[PDB]
Amino acid sequence: MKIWSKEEVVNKLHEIKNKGYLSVPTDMFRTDDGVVGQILERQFGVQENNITLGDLGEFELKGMRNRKAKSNLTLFHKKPVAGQTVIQIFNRFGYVKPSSRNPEVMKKKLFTTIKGGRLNNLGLTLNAKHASEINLYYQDEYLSTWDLNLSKIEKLVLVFAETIGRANSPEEQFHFTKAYMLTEINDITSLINDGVLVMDLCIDQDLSKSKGPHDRGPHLRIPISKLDKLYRNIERLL
DNA sequence: AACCCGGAGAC
DNA sequence: CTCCGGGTTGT
Ligand SMILES: [Ca+2]
Ligand SMILES: [Ca+2]
Ligand SMILES: [Cl-]
């Protein structure tokens, strides 16, 4: 694994911007929201996930399309350590509905954003006692507990891309034009409790093709507009 | 299995 | 806010 110096990241970010719009290789294309991230990784020579460390060594690398209305940033994924499993939560709270991409395919889905301070429409909420005890409740009923390790996101390099071409098409292209270094991470108990940090469940199942469920892992996420509540220091790199 | 890479529109 | 995907890695 290469450990990128801060200066090497800055230099590389300028080189990347200077390349203009980058294309999706034919063999990479898979009708995939995440392709912006795959393209950005390739530019940093990131060849596989590393279990211990952020992608760049000291920093975790994240790419995002610069949408006017911007989806949350996914920080990382983690299964609950105790209580109900994600498949058990899916069994109970999932709902049957056509695929949003392909209306002719019937799915069972649980795509839900769960947060502290409020019950969502499915009755789900979070509370945290410590960072290693984040609990999922359905109403006043305890379900599960997460023990989250924040180590990999202590420092981020977040890079925004402009796009041309249809979203998730083979012709989609990406110009990385802005980037930020985020550091001095805050304790997350209050951020969970106050609904700044959220947890998305992203499980579905292709019933039409008689397939098993696909649990994409509980996603810890945060709106881009609230990054200043998670990190005390945000520095423009590009 | 349990992580990885990320999205949309309504009001 | 409700609601939404594509993968590989580890057993
Ligand atoms: Ca990674
Ligand atoms: Ca990354
Ligand atoms: Cl689980």
DSSP A129-146: EETTEEEEEETTEEEEEE
Instruction: Provide the token pair at A88.
Output: 């058990």
Q: Establish how many alpha carbons lie within 13 A of residue A221's alpha carbon, considering only the half-sphere containing its beta carbon.
A: 18
In which element (H, E) is residue A230 found?
helix A227-230
Instruction: Provide the token pair at A172.
Output: 């989609």
Domain that holds residue A218: 71-148+187-223
Q: Are strands A156-164 and A60-65 parallel, antiparallel or unpaired?
A: parallel
Q: Are residues A208 and A154 in the same domain?
A: no
**How was this structure obtained?**
X-ray
Q: Are residues A18 and A128 in the same domain?
A: no
What's the Å distance between residue A51 CA and nucleotide C4 C1'?
A: 27
Q: Ligand 2: distance of its center to the CA of A215 in Å? A: 19
Determine how many CB atoms are found less than 10 A away from the CB of residue A55.
21
Bridge partners, residue A185, by sequence: A231
What's the Å distance between residue A19 CA and nucleotide B3 C1'?
A: 32
Question: CATH number of the domain that A82 lies in?
Answer: 3.30.70.3570
Nucleotide lying nearest to A80, CA to C1' measure: B2
Q: Are residues A144 and A200 in the same domain?
A: yes
Domain total in chain A: 2
Long-range contacts of A208-215 (CB under 8 A, 24+ apart): A208/A104, A208/A105, A208/A106, A208/A107, A209/A105, A213/A87, A213/A90, A213/A108, A215/A86, A215/A87, A215/A90
In which element (H, E) is residue A22 found?
strand A22-23
Q: Are residues A54 and A19 in the same domain?
A: yes
Task: State the Cα–Cα distance between residues A67 and A70, nearest whole angstrom.
Answer: 5
Task: State the Cα–Cα distance between residues A91 and A99, nearest whole angstrom.
Answer: 18
Which amino acid type is present at position A65? R
Strand B nucleotides in reach of protein CB atoms, 7 A cut-off: 2-10
